[PDB]
Design a protein around this ligand. Structure first.
Ligand code: CDL
Ligand code: CDL
Ligand code: CDL
Ligand code: 3PE
Ligand code: 3PE
Ligand code: PLC
Ligand code: PLC
Ligand code: PLC
Ligand code: PLC
Ligand code: PLC
Lengths: 149, 78, 105, 93, 183, 353, 192, 71, 161
């Protein structure tokens, strides 16, 4: 005697997982494939008649630094982080569209603002004592003084 | 002397039995842990009777040929 | 000689070569004093903080202000939002200003 | 685990073959931006007769690409949502 | 590896906000004294699909470019520009030959890699067809150095690890060659 | 409209993906409360909730709505910080732990090489949020329950952390997705059957579920840390506790039963061969199929949570401390030495690929 | 300083024990029985309890013998190490070392032996273990690996010294000896 | 690796927690619609600690010996 | 708007007005959370997770000791402070947040150039373990020695027997 009433909540729980997986697998895969079609909206959305079947790109996982360089390199060729192209030669705009991130190198805010964490003998010296910065300013000044030789 | 505590250096076998009956959480945890280094000691046997160790992965960068640059190489010139 | 300045992939990092040439100079037996290795020390410290190079950029920015040069006419173009690294900015033939996908690679 | 080692060896050698063509492209990019740095420095400091355009490293036989830049136009300054009113990267709007 | 660095795109735009990252372009071309060369235009999946054929065709030029880097002694990116241009042209030659001789077989393999997380083990069937087509028309053989020829993983008959999902196009194209070539 | 309407969906698409992800997890958690009473009811030869909604399908909705319509008990309206901070920390901790659960290959909100550490680190915060309820409180049952929560945390934390580290050691990775895909040819239930029991025992202690329900022991501490909680603060703690049951059941299926991998490779290919891969419908079915495999395995362990509650009596927490420190820890640290020795002996040290 | 010939700047654990002189074994025994004997002497000097002599319990003598056994080996290990380093007279050890190396070279085998360690780990292992005997009194550390960083040049084994003509070892060039650095990097300069 | 989707999820989790508090706050009938025994602040007989019916010594700030402190 | 500045502003306010020992064990958790998040989003996600894994276990043990030592003292005691003196103190503190005085190092932005030479690409934790277990193995074995001493030390202090 299998009690079917007791198995109903498990069926809904089973369908709970399937709702998440069915949406995530299809919505993400479709978006990656859609954005890999071209560099503008008229190619991503519209489907040409002379085009063949749609080949889908699945989501990526277990990546490393090479995949980050690949993703940026793909963007400079196709406008997508997972673009598709097997052309033996790139466009002319690929020679001058390199992206170079420039960022500050400042210490974390918690280091320089926490009421307790910002206090130490060397932090006070770096912040209130000019002994260190006087010496290092001499090195910078030598760079411009030595230009003439 | 029906249930005395065995002396380890006089009755090693009975000393093992006492702990395997009264302190199973100690006897068998050690027994499992001993199987680690014992298998590591059986490694030389495997290298001679089952199969040799694999060739090391090329994890030291690009393999540079141990030679001088070929000075007669041409092709795909400007 | 213990390893120093090891990159995140186990090999030498950007500034290891500068450090290695300092050690070789300081420990060479052909040197009477440590004066020959003074330029190598500055090069290693410049590799890490770039303090002199940042100082040069400070002078160029300041010198451009006093002559009225426009920062946006002499500098390099940049984008602050990653979503707007669009194909039009990248220069593609069929470029567009629509946002790029950065949600999931 | 013994097949994973073989799978890793195949991947490691596949990356080794692509390494020269990918690094040769990256070497040209660094050289291209290196000349762009010293060209920008030459224009700004041209009227200063004593200024010498050079790297900040004493060792002149080691290539040290510059790692700082001067910021110009903010291309996506006027951006909305789903569309950046992107300013002209190549020259004035 | 997802470590945040100062040399490429980071994990999210909160990382850019904390670093105040500027994504900087340079409109200047390479100087006119340096000879021009057309860059390689293939993306990740085609390049990985063609990795072992670029190796089997440009081995002399790849080694010569890398050996130039070692002999440069720090002055690397400047002193090996001429050797680098040879590498780029040779790699483009292989991709050019793939699209004229083995176009359908080549596009089949890297469409499976895109379908399968770019893992070589998931696309053996399409790879075998591409290897057969390339060898007949370009005389290129994929070889994994350092191991015996009969222990190469891509030639293993019964691999332990196999794709969970099957690429339907690869299954169809593998059956067609089975019934027509190996009678 | 048209174009603006169509690409606005693209601008909102990933938020709906998250909303669907949140909705999917809450449906399982809501109906786990119903399933537990149905499962216990028939094991106890009763029916369980079948009068609230058709065959009892609205019992979870009624419990939440009734509790959300109740007055919140607190000394003052401005004293929300006291009995609400604790429930929120507990709920946010378990919900954030779901960011690394993959429903399929690459279908996790967060993917990183340290997903295992994030999983353990996130759940440890929930332990902190529980003890905050006894914040110099004048309720002696809340105070007595806070002491027991710390005692249980010390018991299971070492064992649960070390077990997951052995599984990560066998694959030489801390990425959860890599651990699942490493179980193609073997499910870790067979080589590590002792560790699966220990993981489940640790999960019962972590979730304060019987036979380790010494925190919320009704016969001992009326309601434990919940004795002073009513209305919304009670729902959040109750919701987070059942979210943790689903999480640990899903982790048991991931670490030892292959995650989303199919039970039968032959049947998995047969079902998927009916749908063209060039159509979006193939990927819907595959997403349902792979999550279904994960759902089936996780449903069995959610059943097992209810099953052990209906069969075993409660164990005192001072005995739980001795059990975890004198029995489980020596066994797990033996296997952490056993496993690398076996692999080295046969030249099978793992690598990431 | 009365320095001597350097044999091995980082002798392997097995070589140190094998090269024990009969006095080194004698001191090992003295250390082993010196610890129970000192417990008797300390009681003889001043009884632990009261004013009369009492033999220490057998359990104390058991643990004392174990402590002395390890102490006797550490002393003997450092006595034999000095001969390899050249700090102590090692004329006998040089003759034995030369015979073993020349015998292995003639067989085209490494005088150091084949290693499971890759080139980095052989170098790293030598860095960790070289000169570690100077702190053997504090904590132990031994060379149990077949590395090539021994502080010697194998060309000095290619000159026949007094009392070595009857060995008649024909030594090949160093590039034919298996598992040596100078005969390992044939195809690639970064792979052995 | 891109974690922009993960950032949105963490944002949603933070907002979702405040929804339970707010929704319960806006849904409950005002005390005047109920028995109308005033605001919860005055009803000290309700906000007092639970001791199974009988009041006891208020020992909230007294130290509690802990038998497992060494563990 | 860098919202971490606001978080530390609130934390500094609550550290000045904290009275009892429970509030102090909350200042600790209110400090680790900004550290963990800022490490996660800027510098090291590995060490953001290591902080969470280790400090939380220390926090709960710290909290359980508060229960055994709470001694009624600061619930009924009075503090004076003054709202004006608190906010003025925090305003003067907020004025100077430049921990370093190298203006060029703090103002000029830098970049790094990527290279493709590292084809064996693994996580930072694998390299840390590779060095820690090979070259700095002595450091690891001393740390193991110190952990052993703490185990003996805790017993000889707390155990009455
Ligand atoms: C499939 C296998 C069962 C089968 O063939 O048909 C029986 C089953 C109906 O059970 P049944 O007709 O009452 O059994 C015949 C007599 O009534 C049963 O009369 P009985 O109760 O006198 O027979 C007793 C029988 C129990 O009846 C059974 O044989 C059930 C078999 C249990 C083991 C497999 C599960 O034997 C036992 O007691 C064994 C129980 C001990 C096993 C413990 C588990 C060990 C693992 O038919 C179905 O399989 C379909 C119904 C299942 C529910 C489907 C919808 C679920 C709702 C989900 C939401 C939508
Ligand atoms: C060997 C048996 C032994 O250690 O002596 C029996 C000894 C005495 O047992 P018992 O039946 O209670 O003797 C009654 C009297 O209290 C025992 O009074 P007692 O004075 O006759 O025994 C004290 C003992 C002192 O025993 C020790 O110092 C233990 C040394 C281990 C460090 O003094 C000795 O007899 C020294 C010779 C025996 C120890 C030789 C250890 C060589 C280093 C390895 O048992 C142990 O000490 C067992 C400790 C080691 C447990 C296993 C640890 C496993 C570690 C590896 C796991 C993975 C594989
Ligand atoms: C405050 C904290 C401070 C820290 C305190 C912690 C203390 C740590 C210090 C302990 C040692 C530090 C080093 C640890 C890292 C070891 C990793 C390693 O070396 O792996 C490479 C090594 C294999 O690399 P390999 O280059 O191929 O060297 C092969 C032989 O090991 C080497 O060639 P072979 O000539 O030795 O041939 C092996 C064979 C030789 O047997 C024969 O065929 C006869 C040849 C004459 C031998 C007769 C004399 C034997 C002496 C009795 O049998 C043996 O001699 C076994 C070697 C071990 C001897 C006992 C170790 C003393 C430990 C005290 O792995 C090992 O098997 C090492 C030996 C076993 C590990 C010892 C563990 C001691 C604990
Ligand atoms: C101590 C015993 C060590 C000797 C041993 O049993 O194994 C040594 C053996 C090395 O000898 P071999 O097999 O010839 O290595 C090939 C070199 N190319 O092969 C090995 O090195 C295996 C590793 C030995 C480790 C044994 C377990 C260590 C004990 C930990 C306590
Ligand atoms: C999910 C959100 C959980 C937190 C929401 C509640 C917000 C309250 C403040 C949270 C932390 C902000 C910084 C506070 C540090 C601790 C200082 C403190 O004593 O707590 C403040 C709280 C208010 O009490 P109050 O009446 O205002 O002052 C005493 C008057 N004699 O006095 C209390 O004792 C109540 C504290 C309740 C338990 C809080 C435990 C700390 C939780 C911190 C998690 C978040 C980390 C911090 C993030 C914000 C950083 C500023
Ligand atoms: C299994 C199966 O065929 O799954 C069909 C499913 C769910 O079945 P269930 O019995 O609720 O699964 C619960 C799993 N337990 C029984 C192991 C707990 O039902 C449909 O959605 C159709
Ligand atoms: C979940 C979906 C199944 C709904 C169950 C149902 O429609 O349940 C029937 C409901 C609830 O009445 P009840 O007394 O709890 O029904 C239980 C019958 N028993 C006692 C025999 C077990 O009745 C009604 O139609 C009244 C309400 C109008 C319809 C709105 C239902 C709520 C919608 C919210 C969820 C979509
Ligand atoms: C213990 C009982 C579970 C069990 O034995 O589960 C393990 C087994 C055998 O699967 P496996 O050899 O671990 O590999 C898994 C191979 N798949 C992918 C085909 C499942 O699964 C079953 O037979 C179900
Ligand atoms: C090496 C292979 C490892 C095997 C892996 C499993 C290890 C388990 C260890 C158990 C030891 C034990 O039950 O310990 C018993 C201890 C203390 O008992 P005690 O006071 O010593 O009395 C017993 C000693 N006698 C009999 C020798 C006198 O507490 C318990 O009752 C713990 C009860 C745990 C039940 C949890 C329910 C889990 C249900 C799982 C459903 C999927
Ligand atoms: C899911 C369940 C949804 C339906 C139940 C909740 C009904 C909310 C509206 C309501 O209560 O409307 C009644 C109210 C006021 O009347 P009150 O009794 O003081 O409301 C209490 C509400 N407070 C707590 C905000 C004071 O009027 C309105 O402002 C109409 C809107």
């Amino acid at each position: 005697m299998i009690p079917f009433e007791a198995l109903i909540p498990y069926a809904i729980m089973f369908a709970g997982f399937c709702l998440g997986g069915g949406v995530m697998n299809s919505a993400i895969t479709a978006d990656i494939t859609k954005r890999a079609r071209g560099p503008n909206q008229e190619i991503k959305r519209n489907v040409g008649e002379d085009e063949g079947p749609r080949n889908y790109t699945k989501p990526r996982y277990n990546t490393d630094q090479w995949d980050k360089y690949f993703a940026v390199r793909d963007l400079r060729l196709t406008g997508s982080l997972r673009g598709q192209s097997d052309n033996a030669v790139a466009e002319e705009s690929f020679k001058t569209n390199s992206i170079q991130p420039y960022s500050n190198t400042r210490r974390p805010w918690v280091l320089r603002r926490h009421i307790i964490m910002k206090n130490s003998p060397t932090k006070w010296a770096r912040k209130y004592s000019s002994r260190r910065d006087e010496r290092e300013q001499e090195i910078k000044d030598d760079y411009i003084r030595g230009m003439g030789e | 002397a029906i249930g005395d505590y065995p002396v380890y250096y006089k009755q090693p076998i009975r000393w093992l039995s006492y702990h395997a009956h009264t302190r199973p959480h100690v006897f068998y945890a050690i027994a499992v842990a001993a199987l680690g280094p014992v298998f590591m000691m059986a490694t030389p046997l495997r290298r001679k009777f089952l199969y040799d160790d694999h060739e090391p992965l090329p994890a030291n960068g690009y393999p540079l040929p141990n030679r001088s640059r070929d000075k007669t190489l041409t092709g795909y010139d400007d | 000689a213990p390893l120093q300045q090891v990159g995140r992939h186990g090999g030498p990092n950007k500034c290891f070569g500068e450090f290695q040439r300092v050690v070789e100079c300081m420990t060479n037996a052909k040197h009477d004093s440590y004066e020959p290795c003074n330029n190598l020390k500055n090069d290693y410290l410049e590799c890490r903080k770039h303090k002199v190079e940042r100082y040069k950029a400070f002078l160029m920015q300041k010198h451009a202000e006093e002559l009225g040069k426009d920062p946006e006419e002499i500098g390099a173009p940049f984008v602050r939002k990653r979503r707007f690294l669009t194909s039009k900015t990248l220069g593609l033939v069929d470029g567009d200003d629509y946002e790029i996908g950065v949600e999931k690679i | 685990n013994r097949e994973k080692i073989e799978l890793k060896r195949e991947k490691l050698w596949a990356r080794a073959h692509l390494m020269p063509l990918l690094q040769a492209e990256q070497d040209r990019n660094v050289v291209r931006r290196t000349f762009a740095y010293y060209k920008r420095e030459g224009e700004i400091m041209k009227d200063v007769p004593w200024w010498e355009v050079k790297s900040t490293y004493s060792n002149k036989d080691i290539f040290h690409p510059p790692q700082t830049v001067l910021f110009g136009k903010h291309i996506d300054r006027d951006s909305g949502l789903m569309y950046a009113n992107s300013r002209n990267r190549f020259g004035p709007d | 590896s997802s470590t945040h660095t100062n040399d490429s795109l980071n994990s999210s735009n909160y990382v850019d906000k904390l670093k105040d990252t500027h994504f900087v372009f340079e409109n200047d071309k390479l100087p006119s004294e340096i000879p021009d060369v057309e860059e390689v235009g293939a993306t990740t999946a085609p390049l990985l699909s063609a990795a072992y054929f670029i190796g089997a065709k440009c081995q002399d030029y790849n080694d010569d470019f890398m050996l130039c880097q070692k002999e440069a002694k720090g002055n690397g990116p400047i002193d090996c520009l001429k050797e680098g241009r040879r590498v780029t042209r040779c790699a483009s030659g292989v991709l050019k030959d793939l699209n004229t001789h083995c176009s359908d077989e080549f596009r089949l393999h890297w469409q499976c890699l895109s379908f399968s997380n770019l893992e070589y083990k998931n696309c053996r069937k399409a790879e075998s067809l591409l290897n057969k087509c390339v060898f007949e028309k370009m005389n290129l053989v994929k070889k994994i150095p350092g191991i015996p020829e009969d222990r190469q993983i891509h030639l293993k008959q019964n691999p332990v690890l196999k794709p969970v999902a099957l690429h339907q196009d690869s299954e169809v194209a593998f059956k067609k060659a089975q019934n027509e070539n190996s009678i | 409209m048209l174009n603006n309407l169509f690409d606005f969906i693209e601008y909102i698409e990933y938020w709906l993906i998250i909303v669907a992800f949140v909705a999917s997890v809450l449906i399982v958690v809501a109906y786990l409360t119903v399933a537990e009473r149905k499962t216990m009811g028939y094991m106890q030869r009763r029916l369980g909730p079948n009068a609230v909604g058709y065959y009892g399908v609205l019992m979870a909705v009624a419990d939440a709505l009734k509790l959300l319509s109740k007055e919140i008990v607190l000394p003052h309206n401005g004293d929300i910080i006291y009995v609400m901070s604790g429930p929120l920390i507990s709920l946010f901790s378990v919900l954030l732990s779901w960011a690394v659960i993959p429903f399929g290959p690459g279908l996790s909100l967060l993917d990183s090489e340290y997903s295992i550490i994030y999983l353990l680190a996130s759940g440890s915060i929930g332990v902190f949020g529980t003890v905050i309820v006894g914040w110099m409180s004048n309720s002696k049952y809340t105070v007595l329950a806070t002491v027991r929560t710390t005692a249980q945390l010390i018991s299971y934390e070492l064992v649960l952390t070390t077990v997951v580290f052995i599984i990560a050691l066998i694959v030489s990775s801390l990425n959860i997705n890599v651990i699942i895909e490493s179980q193609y040819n073997i499910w870790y239930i067979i080589p590590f059957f002792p560790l699966c029991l220990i993981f489940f025992i640790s999960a019962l202690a972590e979730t304060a579920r019987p036979p380790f329900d010494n925190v919320e022991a009704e016969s001992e501490l009326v309601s434990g840390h919940m004795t002073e909680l009513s209305a919304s603060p009670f729902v959040i703690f109750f919701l987070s506790e059942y979210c943790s049951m689903v999480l640990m059941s899903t982790l048991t299926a991931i670490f030892f039963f292959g995650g989303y991998l199919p039970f039968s490779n032959t049947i998995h290919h047969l079902i998927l061969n009916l749908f063209d891969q060039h159509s979006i419908y193939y990927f819907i079915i595959e997403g349902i199929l792979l999550s279904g495999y994960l759902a089936i395995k996780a449903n069995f362990f959610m059943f097992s949570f209810v099953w052990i509650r209906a069969a075993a009596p409660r164990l005192r927490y001072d005995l739980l401390i001795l059990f975890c420190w004198y029995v489980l820890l020596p066994i797990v640290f033996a296997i952490v030495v056993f496993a690398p020795g076996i692999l080295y002996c046969f030249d099978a040290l793992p690598v990431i690929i | 300083m009365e320095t001597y010939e350097l044999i091995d700047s980082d002798p392997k654990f097995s070589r140190v024990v094998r090269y024990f002189r009969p006095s080194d074994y004698l001191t090992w025994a003295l250390g082993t029985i010196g610890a129970p004997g000192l417990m008797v002497l300390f009681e003889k000097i001043e009884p632990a309890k009261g004013n009369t002599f009492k033999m220490p319990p057998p359990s104390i003598m058991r643990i004392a013998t174990t402590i002395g056994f390890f102490g006797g080996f550490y002393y003997a290990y450092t006595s034999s190490t000095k001969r390899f380093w050249g700090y102590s007279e090692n004329a006998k050890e040089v003759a034995k070392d030369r015979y073993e190396v020349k015998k292995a070279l003639s067989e085209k085998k490494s005088p150091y032996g084949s290693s499971l360690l890759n080139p980095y780990q052989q170098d790293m292992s030598a860095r960790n273990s070289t000169n570690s005997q100077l702190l053997l009194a504090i904590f132990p550390w031994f060379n149990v690996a077949n590395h090539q960083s021994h502080g010697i040049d194998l060309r000095k084994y290619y000159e026949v010294r007094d009392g070595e003509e009857n060995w008649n070892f024909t030594l090949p060039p160093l590039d034919q000896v298996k598992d040596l650095d100078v005969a390992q990097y044939k195809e690639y300069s970064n792979y052995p | 690796m891109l974690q922009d989707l993960f950032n949105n999820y963490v944002i949603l989790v933070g907002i979702l927690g405040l929804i339970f508090l707010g929704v319960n706050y806006f849904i409950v009938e005002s005390p005047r619609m109920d028995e109308n025994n005033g605001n919860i602040s005055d009803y000290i007989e309700k906000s007092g600690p639970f001791e199974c019916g009988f009041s006891s010594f208020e020992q909230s700030h007294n130290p509690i010996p802990i038998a497992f402190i060494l563990v | 708007m860098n919202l971490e500045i606001l978080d530390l502003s609130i934390l500094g306010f609550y550290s000045l007005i904290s009275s009892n020992s429970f509030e102090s064990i909350a200042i600790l958790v209110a400090t680790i959370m900004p550290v963990i998040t800022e490490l996660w989003y800027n510098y090291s996600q590995l060490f953001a997770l290591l902080y969470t894994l280790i400090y939380v276990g220390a926090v709960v043990i710290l909290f359980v000791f508060i229960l055994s030592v709470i001694n009624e003292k600061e619930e009924y005691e009075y503090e004076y402070s003054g709202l004006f003196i608190l906010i003025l103190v925090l305003l003067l503190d907020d004025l100077d947040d430049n921990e370093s005085n190298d203006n060029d190092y703090n103002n000029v932005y830098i970049t790094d150039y990527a290279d493709w030479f590292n084809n064996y690409n693994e996580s930072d934790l694998s390299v840390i373990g590779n060095l820690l277990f090979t070259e700095y193995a002595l450091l690891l074995l001393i740390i193991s020695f110190i952990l052993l001493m703490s185990i003996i030390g805790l017993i000889l202090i707390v155990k009455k027997d």
